[PDB]
Amino acid sequence: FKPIRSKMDIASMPLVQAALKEQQATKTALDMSRPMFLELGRSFKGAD
Amino acid sequence: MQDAITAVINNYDVQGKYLDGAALDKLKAYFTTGAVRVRAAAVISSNATTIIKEAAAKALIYSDLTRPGGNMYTTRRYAACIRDMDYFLRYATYAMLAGDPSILDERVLNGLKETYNSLGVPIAATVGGIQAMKEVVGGLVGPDAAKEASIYFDYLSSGLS
Amino acid sequence: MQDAITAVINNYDVQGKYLDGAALDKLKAYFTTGAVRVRAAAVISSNATTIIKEAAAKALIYSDLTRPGGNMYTTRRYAACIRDMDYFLRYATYAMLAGDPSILDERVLNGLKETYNSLGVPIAATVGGIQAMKEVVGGLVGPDAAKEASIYFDYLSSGLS
Amino acid sequence: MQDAITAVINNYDVQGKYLDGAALDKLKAYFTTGAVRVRAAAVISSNATTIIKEAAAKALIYSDLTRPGGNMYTTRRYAACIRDMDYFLRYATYAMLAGDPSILDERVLNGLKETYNSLGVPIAATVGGIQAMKEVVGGLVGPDAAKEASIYFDYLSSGLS
Amino acid sequence: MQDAITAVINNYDVQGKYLDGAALDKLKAYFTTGAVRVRAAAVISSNATTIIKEAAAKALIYSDLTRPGGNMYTTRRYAACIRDMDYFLRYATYAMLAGDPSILDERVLNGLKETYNSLGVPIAATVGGIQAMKEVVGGLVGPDAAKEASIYFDYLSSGLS
Amino acid sequence: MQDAITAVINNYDVQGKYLDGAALDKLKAYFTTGAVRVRAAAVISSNATTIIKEAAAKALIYSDLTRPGGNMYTTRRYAACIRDMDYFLRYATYAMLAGDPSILDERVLNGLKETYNSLGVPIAATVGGIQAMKEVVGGLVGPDAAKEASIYFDYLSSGLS
Amino acid sequence: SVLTKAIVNADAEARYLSPGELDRIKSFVASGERRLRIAQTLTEARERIVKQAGDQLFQIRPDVVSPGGNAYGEKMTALCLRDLDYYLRLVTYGIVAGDVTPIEEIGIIGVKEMYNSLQTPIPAVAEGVRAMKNVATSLLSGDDAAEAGFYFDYLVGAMQ
Amino acid sequence: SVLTKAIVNADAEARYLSPGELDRIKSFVASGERRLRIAQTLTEARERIVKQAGDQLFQIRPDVVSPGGNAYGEKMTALCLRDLDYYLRLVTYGIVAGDVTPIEEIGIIGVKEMYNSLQTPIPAVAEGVRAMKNVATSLLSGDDAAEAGFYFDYLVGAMQ
Amino acid sequence: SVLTKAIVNADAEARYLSPGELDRIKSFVASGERRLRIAQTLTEARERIVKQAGDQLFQIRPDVVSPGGNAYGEKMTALCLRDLDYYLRLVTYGIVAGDVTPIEEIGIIGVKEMYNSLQTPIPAVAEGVRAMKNVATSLLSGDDAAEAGFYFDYLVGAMQ
Amino acid sequence: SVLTKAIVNADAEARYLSPGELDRIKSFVASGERRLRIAQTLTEARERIVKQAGDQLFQIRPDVVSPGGNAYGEKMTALCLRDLDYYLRLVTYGIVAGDVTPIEEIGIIGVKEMYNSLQTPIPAVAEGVRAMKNVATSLLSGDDAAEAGFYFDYLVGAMQ
Amino acid sequence: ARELTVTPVSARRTTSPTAPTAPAMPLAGYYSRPAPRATADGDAQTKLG
Numbered sequence A: 001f002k003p004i005r006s007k008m009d010i011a012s013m014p015l016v017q018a019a020l021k022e023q024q025a026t027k028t029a030l031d032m033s034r035p036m037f038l039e040l041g042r043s044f045k046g047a048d
Numbered sequence B, C, D, E, F: 001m002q003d004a005i006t007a008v009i010n011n012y013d014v015q016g017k018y019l020d021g022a023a024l025d026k027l028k029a030y031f032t033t034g035a036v037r038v039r040a041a042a043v044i045s046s047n048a049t050t051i052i053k054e055a056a057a058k059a060l061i062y063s064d065l066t067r068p069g070g071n072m073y074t075t076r077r078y079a080a081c082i083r084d085m086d087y088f089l090r091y092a093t094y095a096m097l098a099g100d101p102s103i104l105d106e107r108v109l110n111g112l113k114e115t116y117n118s119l120g121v122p123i124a125a126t127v128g129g130i131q132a133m134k135e136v137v138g139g140l141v142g143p144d145a146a147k148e149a150s151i152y153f154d155y156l157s158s159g160l161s
Numbered sequence G, H, I, J: 001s002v003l004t005k006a007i008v009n010a011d012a013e014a015r016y017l018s019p020g021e022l023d024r025i026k027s028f029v030a031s032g033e034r035r036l037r038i039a040q041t042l043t044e045a046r047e048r049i050v051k052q053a054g055d056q057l058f059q060i061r062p063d064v065v066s067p068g069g070n071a072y073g074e075k076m077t078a079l080c081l082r083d084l085d086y087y088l089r090l091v092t093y094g095i096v097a098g099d100v101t102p103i104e105e106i107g108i109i110g111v112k113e114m115y116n117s118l119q120t121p122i123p124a125v126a127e128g129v130r131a132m133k134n135v136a137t138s139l140l141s142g143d144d145a146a147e148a149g150f151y152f153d154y155l156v157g158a159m160q
Numbered sequence K: 001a002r003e004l005t006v007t008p009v010s011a012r013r014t015t016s017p018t019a020p021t022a023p024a025m026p027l028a029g030y031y032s033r034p035a036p037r038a039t040a041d042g043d044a045q046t047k048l049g
């Protein structure tokens, strides 16, 4: 039996693809549950 | 077969790579949609019979297909056809849970086009039976899950044509 | 440098012409707006520091620019940037008094684009710092002077871009 | 310029990171080799003139380079060439003490390739003069320091070619 | 082919001369009429079909030419003739844009006189068809462009006679 | 083939949708990167031969591949291999201009894996030849264009493996 | 570092390092594992030295967290405690470098001009910086506490 | 597009794009935002353009909505305006592509044979298409109205 | 030119030119005044560009002016700079037209065969052209220097 | 071979071999033992022949083995003699085949493109081959030396 | 190739040598080398015409 391949990358699917956009937003953009002084001196980028 | 998660693991295994940031992002994109996939499967499973009934009613019966000379003439063939319909529905539900179409190739599409050519089974009519079940499914499962269920019905139908 | 009045004198001098009706009309058009230019300069000068503060607050700080990796990170560079801002404000006030942009070319724009490219100074961000000071200035100086002050800020900013 | 202690600080400052374990390990890797760097510098400094003499003797003079038509013909140019040699030796000794090549870029290599093209100074011949001084240096400084001195001579020579 | 500008470049290239004052004056004389050429082409192009229709009506049809024994008798030959007319109009529009008749020689006139002699195509009648399209064109394009369009129609017509 | 502007149209046409806000945003995302794509293509085209030479030098020659028994042994096969390399480079430049990989499928990848299996052409070695040209390209085209050029080389190489 | 400062003098006089300069690099690097260890205590307690500093600072001068005070409010205070976190970080950098080069370029050269603009009261800030010494120093052995203390007193010195 | 039309010339001669070809891609793409605005305006008024086109059409030729007319009746009319909606859509596609490739494959090649079969009167249809130009053009600035107008006149041309 | 190229493509299709093609020509006309000016500037400094190009070349490739080198000797070097003068001239032509056109017919089609016969190393001619770019480009404003630079890089490209 | 060449022409014209074609096969095969002896002698002295070609080459072109030369250095020279060993081998093949089919597919078709990429000066490879002719020819009788010489001059010809 | 490169004087310009760590041998003669004005006996008679 010939082995099949895959023609749709799995992160191009709708549910997964939109949960990845949301994942980005949260880490970069925003703060948390630790004291504000610690969050106010953070660099979003890391090496640039 | 493979799912979202094993698709990634095997793609990295052949390169012998530990999972990196790009991989981890893909897996998150699956996990984050997971609860919704489960709810959608429970709706489809529990409405299975009604989906087939409404899909056949819109796209198959009341027609030449069911009247002497037609491929779903005889109780014998009518039963085989809605049996098939149940396969499609059931496997599409697997593909959508897995978030990967590979099972639809391995266990449903492989050789099926020619099997249908050999028996005389009308391909175009079968596709309409698939796209009618999709229509019903998309109503029942709601905004959350509609697009995700839909794609594996579309995978099935471009696999035959 | 030149102002409204010497712009006209030098334009006629190269032709060796005594001032004629067209010249005299231009000079009147300057003199007739003169008192308003003076009042506007006294508002800008005496609010200098507040204009920079409000312009930086709307267009520069609370951002990646002031964070590590940003060009106005370090007290050194933050100081250099608002130092620059003061130059712009001060010279625009000269240009507006003179009613001629020539001083903005001779003593501010010449070589500045490349100086900023060579140091890495972000041009687009600097323009926003200019157009924010204009916004503040136009409120403080009032109907009389708003359009006239504004143009030399616009001269500055299209001089960089 | 920067040195190993300083580079660790500026590399982390741009990320706004406290020095962490990885940083502290790097700095240790410098401090732990520090005493050996000092001893090596004292050997090079105090043998400076002999190193140049032996390096020139193996790689420059007794040749067409020192004959009419050659770039180190004339007492003027012979003096300029061994003057250069002293720069290289001296700066490589700085780089090796600092444990960072950045000074070799800032104060030696920048523009030097084209400066030599413009005067006609033979690049390949100058590299041999560098790699001959390295050879001598590596004998004089001993097992402790040989590899560490050597790299900044190699930095210099791939900076020209 | 060549236009105004390449006519000058090739005339100097064969002498290996950089462009001098006389050359630069010629090129200016072209550039300074350029915008007008473009507007004229847009009028001709967009009225193409009407120009042919009015030119045929004044100079070809309602005649022995369209009657049995005539060269534009038969729908075949009538079609070939107004097809030709479209070529002339279209190429003259190219020549006028280029400000050079060389394209009219290379791609239209070369061999055409004898081609028409060989088929029996009436030359004098074809010239009238050209000079009628010129008449229409000169009305439509206006004072700005009339003389400039006209010359390449005149080039075409003395190329046949 | 299709390009970003064209793909947006055909993707909407099959749904019979006017271009809407989401579509218009996609097209903007292409147009806004367009000037940079052009500059990058002009660098690649004009350095074509040097990119192949440096890519072969890092990833193909000085090896068993070029020795008797190797697939790029014989001037015939060496010529065929760097001929291929030029195809890849050239088409990747098309894909990157178009902002769509569809041309790489239609005119390069389709059947190529099996063609190489049938001739014995080493696939893994060819991928390294692709990823070496990418490395060179990314240096030559600069920050502006590096990521965008790179992806279509990566498209090519996962198309073979 | 000591190097960045110990080489700059060499290059400026066009010469190789002195026996003295070599000796101090020697002694300095020998104190590496230990200096690394004093800077690890301080990162452990990074947010707790800072919180404790904040309190001491406002007793000795509260007015800054009052109607007409530069640090009045929850987010005008978040910024203030954040600046104290910045300077503690720079102090850990200085201790591991063995001089101020890094501390200086990052947070004292230009600091007068920055804070004058913000009209943060700078001299209150020196006292705030001083408080951190008191807390940090109570989490270190006598010998390590002194070594740390020099860098705190430097910032206090510059700052004003 | 301009790209599709042009690259095709590159590949067919086995070569990279010319300076000329590169220049036109650059000039073309610079004219992008404007073309996108022209499509937006027209997309935004599609229902008005179609309806007013349909009135303008039936005055200039009503007989089609009469006993022996191809578009006689409510659902035979629901189809004629729908076809007018189709062509306006294709016109927006053409404007953003900068040529007709898409317009052509979708709705002119084969159109004679389609409409001859339906015995829709095709030449009435050209006039109907022309009416849309008149409406659409009244919702665009002079410069944008001309740029749009070329694509309307193309469709009018191809149905011929 | 830009004109010749546009037209030739038009005539091949046997249809009048387009109305966005009436865009490249329009751009070229505005560009031409600037283009004419750049060529004049290049023409003024021709002797300096050639000579300094020739020094830059022989440093980078001394082998061509050596015993077994194509340009070895005083009059084998004189002809070499004359060829560099030829190509600078063609570069001014290319800039002014707005399209490379004539330069191709004058100095690249057949150039491989010519120089192979003379045994001239082609890639070192390409270097001589890069050298001229460097000199010429230092006598032009940033914007004009780039516009000129495209034509230098073309010639460098064609000798390949 | 002579066989392959004769046959291919036969089959392509759909016919049996000509008297001429048959005659040349006969004359060719009669020279078999002689041709085999010519290949043996040269195979037996291969290492010497390359060493003397390589000396003759570097005298005539000391530049190739000079700073900006393709064969500059010990391992850029090692590969150069290896290429000379390759071509001598192909020359022995050609002599025993009685034509170039094998020589051609293995080492001239594609050779311009290969060496242009590597930037190897082709005409100095042709010189290396002349140098091998001179050495090889001094180890063969007059008659055999001529027969060998044709194949050397062919390779020299094809690199052109 | 060692021999060719090394083991051989090769062609540079012309000429060589005599220099560090050093030298070559073809012998010499003090009143052996011919003086440069340089030549003949009988050039003198024959030179003129």
Ligand SMILES: CCC1=C(C)/C(=C/C2=NC(=C\c3[nH]c(/C=C4\NC(=O)[C@H](C)[C@H]4CC)c(C)c3CCC(=O)O)/C(CCC(=O)O)=C2C)NC1=O
Pocket (backbone or CB within 6 Å): B061, B062, B063, B066, B067, B072, B073, B074, B075
């Ligand atoms: C020759 C073999 C054969 C049989 C028997 C057959 C029956 C058959 N009965 C049908 C419907 C039907 N059949 C019935 C029959 C009944 N309703 C009742 O309550 C009674 C119990 C019963 C009458 C005695 C009804 C009411 C429908 C319509 C059901 C629907 O449309 O949902 C249909 C779908 C309509 C169609 O497309 O024709 C088929 C195919 N088809 C076949 O090929």
Ligand SMILES: CCC1=C(C)/C(=C/C2=NC(=C\c3[nH]c(/C=C4\NC(=O)[C@H](C)[C@H]4CC)c(C)c3CCC(=O)O)/C(CCC(=O)O)=C2C)NC1=O
Pocket (backbone or CB within 6 Å): D061, D062, D063, D066, D067, D072, D073, D074, D075, D078
């Ligand atoms: C035209 C300007 C000019 C001068 C003068 C010059 C001199 C010069 N003398 C040299 C060596 C030398 N020169 C001498 C000379 C002497 N030994 C003694 O004890 C005596 C005091 C003296 C003879 C009167 C010696 C012995 C060496 C060899 C030194 C060595 O190889 O270490 C060398 C290195 C060998 C070489 O590569 O040529 C140079 C360049 N170069 C120049 O470009």
Ligand SMILES: CCC1=C(C)/C(=C/C2=NC(=C\c3[nH]c(/C=C4\NC(=O)[C@H](C)[C@H]4CC)c(C)c3CCC(=O)O)/C(CCC(=O)O)=C2C)NC1=O
Pocket (backbone or CB within 6 Å): D060, D065, D070, D071, D072, D077, D078, D080, D081, D082, D084, D085, D087, D088, D107, D108, D115, D119, D121, D122, D123, D125, D126, D129
């Ligand atoms: C502080 C860092 C620094 C460096 C390294 C430096 C190099 C340098 N070398 C120079 C010249 C030179 N450099 C050399 C060097 C050599 N000649 C040879 O044949 C050998 C291959 C080589 C010695 C190994 C010569 C001969 C000149 C003189 C060129 C002339 O006559 O103008 C000059 C021109 C100004 C002058 O003549 O002093 C500079 C600036 N300048 C600097 O500021």
Ligand SMILES: CCC1=C(C)/C(=C/C2=NC(=C\c3[nH]c(/C=C4\NC(=O)[C@H](C)[C@H]4CC)c(C)c3CCC(=O)O)/C(CCC(=O)O)=C2C)NC1=O
Pocket (backbone or CB within 6 Å): E061, E062, E063, E066, E067, E072, E073, E074, E075
């Ligand atoms: C034997 C092949 C052949 C044909 C058929 C032919 C037709 C023909 N019809 C013409 C005009 C015409 N033909 C018509 C015909 C009609 N008007 C209508 O509306 C009706 C649809 C149609 C009558 C059934 C009209 C009205 C004109 C005058 C048009 C004008 O002058 O602009 C003319 C131009 C007048 C002339 O010079 O004769 C020609 C040549 N010529 C030929 O060589």
Ligand SMILES: CCC1=C(C)/C(=C/C2=NC(=C\c3[nH]c(/C=C4\NC(=O)[C@H](C)[C@H]4CC)c(C)c3CCC(=O)O)/C(CCC(=O)O)=C2C)NC1=O
Pocket (backbone or CB within 6 Å): E060, E065, E070, E071, E072, E077, E078, E080, E081, E082, E084, E085, E087, E088, E107, E108, E115, E119, E121, E122, E123, E125, E126, E129
């Ligand atoms: C691209 C440049 C170009 C031109 C201009 C061109 C002209 C041209 N005109 C032709 C015939 C013709 N040309 C005409 C023209 C006319 N009949 C009249 O009575 C009038 C006087 C005149 C129109 C005003 C006619 C009637 C024929 C057909 C002759 C035949 O029946 O064979 C033919 C013979 C092939 C054919 O029939 O198409 C050519 C090539 N070909 C070209 O490639």
Ligand SMILES: CCC1=C(C)/C(=C/C2=NC(=C\c3[nH]c(/C=C4\NC(=O)[C@H](C)[C@H]4CC)c(C)c3CCC(=O)O)/C(CCC(=O)O)=C2C)NC1=O
Pocket (backbone or CB within 6 Å): F061, F062, F063, F066, F067, F072, F073, F074, F075, F078, J064, J069, J070, J071, J072, J076, J077, J079, J080, J081, J083, J084, J086, J087, J106, J107, J118, J120, J121, J122, J124, J125, J128
């Ligand atoms: C049997 C058919 C055949 C031939 C002939 C062949 C030649 C060949 N010559 C090569 C390199 C080379 N060949 C030379 C040859 C020369 N340098 C000079 O200047 C002289 C003109 C010449 C010696 C006479 C040199 C110097 C290199 C190294 C070039 C480089 O590495 O860039 C290489 C790349 C290195 C490798 O991977 O082997 C190949 C494949 N390959 C083949 O399959």
Ligand SMILES: CCC1=C(C)/C(=C/C2=NC(=C\c3[nH]c(/C=C4\NC(=O)[C@H](C)[C@H]4CC)c(C)c3CCC(=O)O)/C(CCC(=O)O)=C2C)NC1=O
Pocket (backbone or CB within 6 Å): F060, F065, F070, F071, F072, F077, F078, F080, F081, F082, F084, F085, F087, F088, F107, F108, F115, F119, F121, F122, F123, F125, F126, F129
């Ligand atoms: C337009 C798109 C297109 C592509 C890409 C293409 C590839 C292609 N490569 C081929 C052969 C080949 N391809 C190679 C390639 C290589 N050899 C190696 O060892 C390396 C790993 C690699 C170069 C990096 C070689 C050596 C052959 C010759 C095989 C033979 O001797 O038959 C052939 C067989 C016909 C021929 O020999 O030309 C095709 C069609 N054809 C196309 O139409």
Ligand SMILES: CCC1=C(C)/C(=C/C2=NC(=C\c3[nH]c(/C=C4\NC(=O)[C@H](C)[C@H]4CC)c(C)c3CCC(=O)O)/C(CCC(=O)O)=C2C)NC1=O
Pocket (backbone or CB within 6 Å): C061, C062, C063, C066, C067, C072, C073, C074, C075, G064, G069, G070, G071, G072, G075, G076, G077, G079, G080, G081, G082, G083, G084, G086, G106, G107, G118, G120, G121, G124, G125, G128
């Ligand atoms: C590493 C070198 C460095 C430092 C130190 C630095 C400080 C700095 N402090 C800021 C604000 C601030 N800083 C403070 C600090 C205080 N308020 C008080 O009353 C107290 C005296 C003090 C706390 C001890 C406050 C309240 C603000 C907000 C001011 C405003 O938003 O107007 C801002 C603007 C907000 C931002 O965009 O980040 C910067 C850049 N930036 C730097 O690059």
